[PDB]
Amino acid sequence: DVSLSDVMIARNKSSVAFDATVQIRNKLVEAYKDLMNMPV
Amino acid sequence: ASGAKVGADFNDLLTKAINNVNTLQKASGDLQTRFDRGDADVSLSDVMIARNKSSVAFDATVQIRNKLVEAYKDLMNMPV
Amino acid sequence: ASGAKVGADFNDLLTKAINNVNTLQKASGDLQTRFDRGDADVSLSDVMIARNKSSVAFDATVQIRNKLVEAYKDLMNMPV
Amino acid sequence: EYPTSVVLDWIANYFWPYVRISSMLMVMTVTGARFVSPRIRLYLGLAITFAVMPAIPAVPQDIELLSFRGFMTIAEQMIIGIAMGMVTQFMIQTFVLLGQILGMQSSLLLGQLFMFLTTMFFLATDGHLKMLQLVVFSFKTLPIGSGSLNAVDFREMAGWLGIMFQTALSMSLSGIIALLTINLSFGVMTRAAPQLNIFSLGFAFALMVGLLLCWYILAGLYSHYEMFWTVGEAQICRLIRL
Amino acid sequence: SLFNVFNVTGSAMSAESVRLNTTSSNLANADSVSSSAKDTYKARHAVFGAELSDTVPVKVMGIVESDKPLSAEYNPDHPLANEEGYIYKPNVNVMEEMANMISASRAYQTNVQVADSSKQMLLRTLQMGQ
Amino acid sequence: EDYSVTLQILALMTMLGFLPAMVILMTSFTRIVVVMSILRQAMGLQQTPSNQVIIGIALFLTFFVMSPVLNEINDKAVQPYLNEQVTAREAFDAAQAPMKAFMLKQTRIKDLETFVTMSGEQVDNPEDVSMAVLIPAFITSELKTAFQIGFMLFLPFLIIDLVVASVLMAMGMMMLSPMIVSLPFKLMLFVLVDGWNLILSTLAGSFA
Amino acid sequence: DYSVTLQILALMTMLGFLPAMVILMTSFTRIVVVMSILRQAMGLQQTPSNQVIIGIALFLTFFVMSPVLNEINDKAVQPYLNEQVTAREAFDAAQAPMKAFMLKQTRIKDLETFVTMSGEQVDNPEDVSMAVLIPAFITSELKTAFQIGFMLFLPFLIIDLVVASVLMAMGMMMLSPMIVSLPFKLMLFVLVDGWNLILSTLAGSFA
Amino acid sequence: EDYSVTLQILALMTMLGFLPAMVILMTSFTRIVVVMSILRQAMGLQQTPSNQVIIGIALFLTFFVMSPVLNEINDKAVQPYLNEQVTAREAFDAAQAPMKAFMLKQTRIKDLETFVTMSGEQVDNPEDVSMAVLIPAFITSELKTAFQIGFMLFLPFLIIDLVVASVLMAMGMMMLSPMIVSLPFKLMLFVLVDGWNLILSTLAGSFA
Amino acid sequence: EDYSVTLQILALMTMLGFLPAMVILMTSFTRIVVVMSILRQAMGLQQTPSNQVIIGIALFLTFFVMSPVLNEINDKAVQPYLNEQVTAREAFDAAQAPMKAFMLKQTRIKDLETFVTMSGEQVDNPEDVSMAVLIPAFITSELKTAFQIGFMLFLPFLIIDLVVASVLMAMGMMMLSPMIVSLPFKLMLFVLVDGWNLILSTLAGSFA
Amino acid sequence: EDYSVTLQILALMTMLGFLPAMVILMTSFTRIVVVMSILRQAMGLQQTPSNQVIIGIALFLTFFVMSPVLNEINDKAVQPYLNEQVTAREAFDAAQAPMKAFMLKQTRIKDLETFVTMSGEQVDNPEDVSMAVLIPAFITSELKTAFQIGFMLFLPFLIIDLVVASVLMAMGMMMLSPMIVSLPFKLMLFVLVDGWNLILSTLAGSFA
Amino acid sequence: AISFDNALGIHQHTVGVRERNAEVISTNIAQANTPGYKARGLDFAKELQAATSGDKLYRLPTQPDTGDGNTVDLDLERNLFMQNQIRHQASLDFLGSKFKNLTKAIKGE
Amino acid sequence: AISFDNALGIHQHTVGVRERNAEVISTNIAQANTPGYKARGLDFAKELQAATDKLYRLPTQPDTGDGNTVDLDLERNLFMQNQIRHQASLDFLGSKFKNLTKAIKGE
Amino acid sequence: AISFDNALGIHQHTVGVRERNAEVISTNIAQANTPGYKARGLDFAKELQAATSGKLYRLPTQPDTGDGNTVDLDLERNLFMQNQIRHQASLDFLGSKFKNLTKAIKGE
Amino acid sequence: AISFDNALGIHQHTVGVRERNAEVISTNIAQANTPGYKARGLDFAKELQAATSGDKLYRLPTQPDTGDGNTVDLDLERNLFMQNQIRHQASLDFLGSKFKNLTKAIKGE
């Protein structure tokens, strides 16, 4: 019932979604770490 | 619903695909050796079809494996 | 269950695979040079089978080495 | 089925709970320490999320991984995690406050002595286990999809500076009075002859008594920590609405 | 599912293979008088079928003997003849067997190209996003 | 006309990279930290509160006071954009405006005049001045405002220290340092009046 | 059983997870943390360097965990090479020696906490799943490393307090005690033969 | 024969690579940053204004004071270049000329004299000197000018510090630290004089 | 049975991968860096000698002290291997023997005893331990030796710091920082004693 | 004999990789870098000149002081090389000689003597020592020479600090920190003496 | 915005239709010799519309059949199969570049 | 497991047997005219057993005094069949390494 | 020194000359039937030297049949075949010069 | 032991020898009709040994010449040229793999 097009699209969508959430998590954490390491 | 059900559902999807790829590889192997040993009930067309599907099926397996490893290697290089 | 005992055991396991690869390459080279020199009792199939085996064996040796070297680099370059 | 739904849901059902767990660890007292490498901490967050996965309810499927709403979800998972982490930092640094006020009053690094011992209190009382139990409970009573820290939670967390001074003064009030009365007694008793004065001679006398009083402080510090942890734990449950 | 074209092209390869085997038997038994007049060999032909209830596979539904009358020959010398000295021979027509040989071989090789080109499309699909 | 999905993602990641700047240059983070810096400096403790908890409390305080403006951005900009009601260009402008309004509520007219003349541009309404010129005027007002609050916070601790020194000198003991005696009194009076709660009211409510 | 082509792909993939297995299953975690804590104890910040710290841990985690590798070899590697066992059974035969080592090197309280969090009903400690044992192992090993490391910190904190109070006794309030304490911090570690004392106890700490 | 498009892009990407160097050496960023640094150390506050805020203020100030030269580059080197009116080599020269002129207005002849002799080139007019010689001369002049302004702003805070110490010593309370009591007056003077707006205006007006 | 040429190329190309590990573990690079690192901390300057210059001098020093072992490797293993006198394994063993002699010469017994017991192998003479158990024992010995050398070099600078701090307290100026008033004398002592030559000479001498 | 074109490119591309190493070891970059760090330490400001500016001035100055060497490299090596008058072998040797001559002129005999005995080579005259034995000796002498120049600059600021500390102590205020009071005068001394021109000219003139 | 639909466009539905068309064309080629079989056609516009949100077309023969009844013109089927494969390759390139650009923006690489 | 014997199957031996079979057929065609030569046939199952012989072919027609039992019609057909099957065995055994290399390299 | 004249060698000029030789042979084959046409050759050694530092007649093996044409068609085919083989080798040598040159400037 | 002689084996010499044999066979085919020309043959074992560690023979006729003195059996010469061409290609495949195996070991890929 499934084809290689659906599998490849599912693989690409998962890769893009996973890459999106990792980078945004990385950006926010780097923003948090920058704020913590500042001279009060 | 819990998160384990989604994880188990994802695990069964991977297991089903691996079994399907393994089934094709074993099916191609039998048809290859049946025609190679000299059995007259096996057609060269069916053998070539069998090994064409197994080769494509395994190539799909390689692509998914590389993406999983690349995602994990991407994951381990993250601020934490 | 001593450090020297297991160190020797894995060394024996590791040197066995290296010797197995070396055996395939020497056998492949020996078959090639006998056929190439003009020996009549050497078939091209035996030459081609052996050299295909050596290529696969050496390819595995390089790939396994890359995994070990990358694994070593991962543990040494980690931000302790 | 279309394989997109299966793969996307697991990533959404794993990373989003992991983000809250990981964010709490990086701000936590022990797991967020400078001694541990990020890789060990990263594996710990990965292992904890995988193990506690059955207790985590399924995230809503309405929010997409690649959408601005999903982007907001990642941010608000961190804010919950940092909230728990900052509470743990508040307690330990309050003991660091307790160490330095005694050291300052001792005519004098003493915060590190209290910081190390308070870290031992955190580990010995299984404080790390309780925090991990708190964050998994947060998944139940504070679902990932709908829910985030409100304005009142920010104000309650911003009001912990007064909690620091009140708790630090409460622990040291008996000792600080002792430090003052002996120094005042030493001053008045030696005030008869202005030739002696104190200066550096007063420095030596003050520091010897101050170290001795810190010996008394460590004798009854555990009871104060137990009361302090109850106040902090209640605040954490208030954040997760438990 | 992932190889629907292969099942159809491959079915044609198996279907057209049977038609060539049937043609070979008809030409190899064009002069086999055998015995009697009802056990005599008759030209056989495969029947192709397509069940259209996407892709419609081709299925061989059995071998069917031709309805052409047997070729009668006057030969009151063959011991297997009859009262009037007639030996009935298979109703195999060489011209129609040659045409079937041409049609079967070309159609069989045409499906090879389609099946071979179908694999290329599958291989290119794996390269999506790379 | 509207930005493509690829370009909108690029803009989103860019603002995340500049996120620390937006906190310390556009929000209320600068005023809170400076005021809390004075409070630590006023008392005898030098590094005792430590830098980590001050920033963490400041971050939570900012999220408290920026909650009205952040919610206004959420409603006006994020909600139409998520529902695909408006394009990306106008949604970005709809998010920029509440930040501009908040910065105007915390700035002074003199500060704006200095920078608008400094930029060498022409304008007649403060409401439509470019955010590039509003930012330096905003923080300049924030630093001046924070010094005012810090000066008021420094006075009671100076009052306590001077009284203790005078008492010790009047009793004749010209040999004892006032700092050691005064420190518990400053801390005790900081606790029994619940000083931080009062500072929260005069700092969080100072923006309005 | 899986085809030859697939089972080659399986071992090749997990060959790249070898660093992952080391960090969260063997004794690499405890030693590195104790090494890192002791490095911060002395005034030197990165004098031992990260690479040397890791290199010592890798040698230690091989000597100490040598009994684990022996059992895995003779119970999983050897039967598989003799065709006496299949792929899945050999992999399971390797988990058991490593799961036993991890189970005995954890704290009951941590396992009790994790089984509650995992939501699985297990009556006895020795039957817990590996999915919940791995996080429980590292969590307990972190507590052990912190408790061991900070006790090593105490003698070096004693020197700091002594020298700082002595300097403050003479009114030299501006001289930083850390630079004065640094020569004596190094001497304490070398007089007690620290680099041999900590490693001997760390090796003997495991079981 | 202007540079090919591929080389023109390669040159522009290289200039963006040296963008921090251009700002910190060829612009007004250094002088503003140093003067702010001296002022911060002049008061009792060690790092209360924080480093990111100081650089953030300086970046906006250095952009405003260099808007005239930035516009002159645009009106003489960018727009003719985009309108296909000047050779790319000519446009690069047309952009460099206003930058060189601005750096010469804020440099000292002694700095040029020592660097020209150091480079060992026979040049007489102080307008056709190489950028290799002009940049070190300019940054040297900016450091010296910043010290002069820093000393100017330091004196009033030194006056307050001496007065407070003298008054405390008059009462015989020598044990009391003058710094803790001096600081609120330092904040007091700087805020009723409108220091933040004043100093940034003077720094803006200094570059002329 | 000698290995094939392809394996031998693959075998010694792997040695290049592990080359940094050999320098930091099996060579003299560890002690020299540590001693100069402690020496830098002994003087007032924090990072004036810089890490790269410290490593650069250490690389030259470790090359000069390991020349006899490198020459022995070439004259016992490399030359017979290039001249087809010995096989690959014999060449590998012939290269390792001088390296093992160098590590065993500069190690401690107790450190060897500690590691042989933990590994669990029989030892009757020092020259029977595998390289797997000699490497961790050697680096531990070097760190102890480096710390002892660093302690000696630290003492003369500690004496100066105590003298200059005590003298300032003799006049009664406690607020004046001893560190600033001691740096010129710490640097001068390192000059007229010519530290950069004898200290490197001792490091070279200590290995032989 | 002559290296092939492919090998000549490989060697040249290799030297670009080691370009940072040659700057901090074989040029005047290190001494100028060290002196400014000591000069910055002498004044009260510890990060006011800023690392980027100091390295930027060091890069400009090392370009000016190495120009006679670079021009000799261009004339002796590159011009015969580009005109095919010398081979690749001769060009590289002809380029090395002026660089070796520069390092030999700024080195010390004892430093050369120290490494010559360490390298175990038979050297008759200093002007023919190997490059591997000169680079560690040259950087050693530069560090020692840098300390001597730094001590010269440290004294005038130290005298001001001592003078102001004693004056404050005479008036009885033993709690006022001399560092705050001394800082304006430390800056002024560097200004009216024209320090940023005097120091750099001496550093450039120290290689002649 | 910022969604996979708005980002991929119609290049995800087009690929499925092109594979559907190849299945139809290959069926006609295989069933060319079957008597009585009628050639099957596919409407791309209708199929793409159905795919985006979610009947039998027969091909008119150019010449009469020789009696069998099969209306498959194998000359046309090969030409259409060749065209379908080219347009399918373009669609994969179009769709593949959509994911590459999305990954490029979310990572800045 | 994971050994060349199992990875290659029996395709490693079939190529050799098809070469031996081709040699025998070549001998039969060459020796067709030499009298007294008896046609030699190779039994496929025998070399199958030898992997895990050289028989005589009984004529369908009598000789003509030569005693030679070689039918050139049969030999040509048997040589054509063996050559076609030999190429298929090369394709089967060749793809065994191509799949094996792709599994190891992952590309 | 590093320059293309020293890096490419003569292979930059040899490729061009053999292309000219292809034209010369091609115009001989076309004019095989044209009477009065004399087959012309190209001296590779002389042409290469001219290109590096900067149309002879072929003698008939047999008399012409009477038209006046001295084109020996079988010789032209043999010469064209050899010229095409060496032209491919010249491309192989010259092309490899750039690829090895790129590998040096890139380091991999 | 790492040297081109050890790595390339005898395949670096066999290619040149089989090229020489092809020239000797080709000149026999070309000179088939020249009377007085004796067919020449090259011994492979001798030529390979001479090449390895640093003069073509005469081929005896199976039948007498028909009066021209030429002993070239053009039927035999074609067979030897075909065999030498196949063995020449096989040596090229052997020698070509020797360099490729060295390159992948050096580059690690």
With an 8 Å Cβ cutoff, are B62 and L102 in contact? yes
- Deposited resolution, Å: 3.0
With an 8 Å Cβ cutoff, are G5 and B25 in contact? yes
Chain F interface with D: residues with Cβ < 8 Å: 12, 36, 44-45, 47-50, 52-53, 56-57, 60-61, 63-64, 67, 78, 81-82, 171-176, 180-181, 183-184, 187-188, 190-191, 194-197, 200, 204
Contacts of A4 in chain E (CB under 8 A): 2, 122, 125-126
Please give the method by which this entry was determined: cryo-EM
Amino acid at E7: N
Sequence-separated (6 or more) residues with CB below 8 Å from residue G125: G103, G108, G111
Report helix, strand or coil for E88.
Answer: strand
CA–CA distance, J53 with J30 (Å, rounded to integer): 15
Sequence-separated (6 or more) residues with CB below 8 Å from residue G99: G130, G133
What sign has the CA pseudo-torsion E30, E31, E32, E37? positive
Helix (DSSP H) and strand (DSSP E) numbers for chain I: 11, 0
One DSSP character per residue, chain H reads -PPPHHHHHHHHHHHHHTHHHHHHHHSSHHHHHHHHHHHHHHSS-SSSS-HHHHHHHHHHHHHHHTHHHHHHHIIIIIHHHHTT-S-HHHHHHHHHHHHHHHHHHT--HHHHHHHHHHHT----STTS--HHHHHHHHHHHHHHHHHHHHHHHHHHHHHHHHHHHHHHHHTT-TTS-HHHHHHHHHHHHHHHTTHHHHHHHHHHHH--
Q: How many CA atoms lie within 13 A of F143 on its CB side?
A: 27
Optimal mutation site among D11, D65, D67, D72, interface K, most CBs of chain K within 10 A: D67
With an 8 Å Cβ cutoff, are B62 and L103 in contact? yes
With an 8 Å Cβ cutoff, are B22 and G6 in contact? yes
CA–CA distance, F187 with F183 (Å, rounded to integer): 6
What sign has the CA pseudo-torsion C11, C13, C19, C21? negative
Contacts 24+ apart (CB under 8 A), H14-22: H20/J52, H21/J52, H21/J56
Interface of H with F in 96-115 (CB under 8 A): none
N58 backbone dihedrals φ, ψ, rounded to 5°: -105, 140
CA–CA distance, J33 with J36 (Å, rounded to integer): 6
With an 8 Å Cβ cutoff, are G5 and L104 in contact? no
Report helix, strand or coil for I49.
Answer: coil
Say how far residue J120 (Cα) sits from the centre of its chain. 28
Query: Any chain I CB within 8 A of the CB of J132?
Result: yes
Q: Where are the beta strands (DSSP E) in K1-109?
A: 40-41, 57-58
The residue to which tokens 């060999």 are assigned: E41
Q: What angle do CA M35, M38, M41 make, to 5 degrees?
A: 145
Say how far residue M94 (Cα) sits from the centre of its chain. 15
Taking residue G181's Cβ as centre, other Cβ atoms within 10 Å add up to 22
Query: L touches A (3+ CB pairs < 8 Å)?
Result: no
Tokens of J55: 């390295």
Tokens of B71: 């995602």
Contacts of D38 in chain C (CB under 8 A): 79
What sign has the CA pseudo-torsion N12, N15, N17, N20? negative
Contacts of F25 in chain H (CB under 8 A): 53, 56
One DSSP character per residue, D80-115 reads HHHHHHHHHHHHHHHHHHHHHHHHHHTT--HHHHHH
Tokens of M12: 């930059």
One DSSP character per residue, G68-126 reads HHHHHIIIIIHHHHTTSS-HHHHHHHHHHHHHHHHHHTS-HHHHHHHHHHHT---SSGG
Contacts of F175 in chain H (CB under 8 A): 175
Say how far residue B20 (Cα) sits from the centre of its chain. 6
What sign has the CA pseudo-torsion I14, I17, I19, I24? negative
Q: What angle do CA H173, H175, H180 make, to 5 degrees?
A: 95
With an 8 Å Cβ cutoff, are C22 and I4 in contact? yes
Q: How far is D38 from chain C (nearest CA, A)?
A: 7
Residues I74, I110: contact at Cβ < 8 Å?
Answer: no
What dihedral angle (degrees, nearest 10) is formed by the CA atoms of H25, H29, H32, H35? -40
Tokens of F121: 């541009």
What is the Cα gyration radius of chain L? 18
In eight-state DSSP terms, residue F18 is T
Tokens of D138: 């947060």
I115 backbone dihedrals φ, ψ, rounded to 5°: -85, -30
Partners of E87 in the β-ladder: E73
Q: What angle do CA J139, J143, J144 make, to 5 degrees?
A: 120
Tokens of I136: 């961790």
CA–CA distance, L102 with F198 (Å, rounded to integer): 71
Partners of E60 in the β-ladder: E48
Phi-psi region of L56 (alpha: psi -120 to 50; beta: other; left: phi over 0): beta
The residue to which tokens 């409108």 are assigned: H194
One DSSP character per residue, M47-76 reads HHHHHH---EEPPPSS--SSS-----HHHH
Query: Any chain C CB within 8 A of the CB of I118?
Result: yes
CA–CA distance, I76 with I96 (Å, rounded to integer): 10
CA–CA distance, E80 with E82 (Å, rounded to integer): 7
Chains I, J: CB contacts within 8 A come to 108
Contacts of G159 in chain D (CB under 8 A): none
J193 backbone dihedrals φ, ψ, rounded to 5°: -85, -10
Query: Any chain G CB within 8 A of the CB of B69?
Result: yes
Taking residue F93's Cβ as centre, other Cβ atoms within 10 Å add up to 11
Q: How many CA atoms lie within 13 A of K107 on its CB side?
A: 15
Strands M56-57 and K57-58, sheet pairing: unpaired
Distances, alpha carbon B47 to alpha carbons B14, B32, B41, E13, in Å:
27, 6, 11, 11
Query: Any chain F CB within 8 A of the CB of A2?
Result: no
Distances, alpha carbon B49 to alpha carbons B46, E10, E115, E125, H207, in Å:
5, 7, 8, 18, 81
With an 8 Å Cβ cutoff, are J175 and I175 in contact? yes
Contacts of I7 in chain N (CB under 8 A): 105
One DSSP character per residue, B33-61 reads HHHHHT-TT--HHHHHHHHHHHHHHHHHH
Contacts of I184 in chain J (CB under 8 A): 150-151, 154-155, 158
Max CA pair span of chain C: 64
CA–CA distance, F50 with D111 (Å, rounded to integer): 11
Tell which residue, G34, E114, H192, K39, has the closest CA to residue B52.
E114
Tokens of M43: 């001296």
The residue to which tokens 């005259």 are assigned: J125
Q: Which residues of D6-33 are buried (b: 16+ CB within 10 A; e: fewer)?
A: bbbbbbbbbbbbbbbbbbbbbbbbbbbb
E60 backbone dihedrals φ, ψ, rounded to 5°: -75, 125
CA–CA distance, L38 with L55 (Å, rounded to integer): 10
CA–CA distance, L88 with L11 (Å, rounded to integer): 10
Residues E126, A8: contact at Cβ < 8 Å?
Answer: yes
The angle that helices J29-42 and J195-205 make with each other, rounded to 10 degrees, is: 150
Contacts of L14 in chain C (CB under 8 A): none
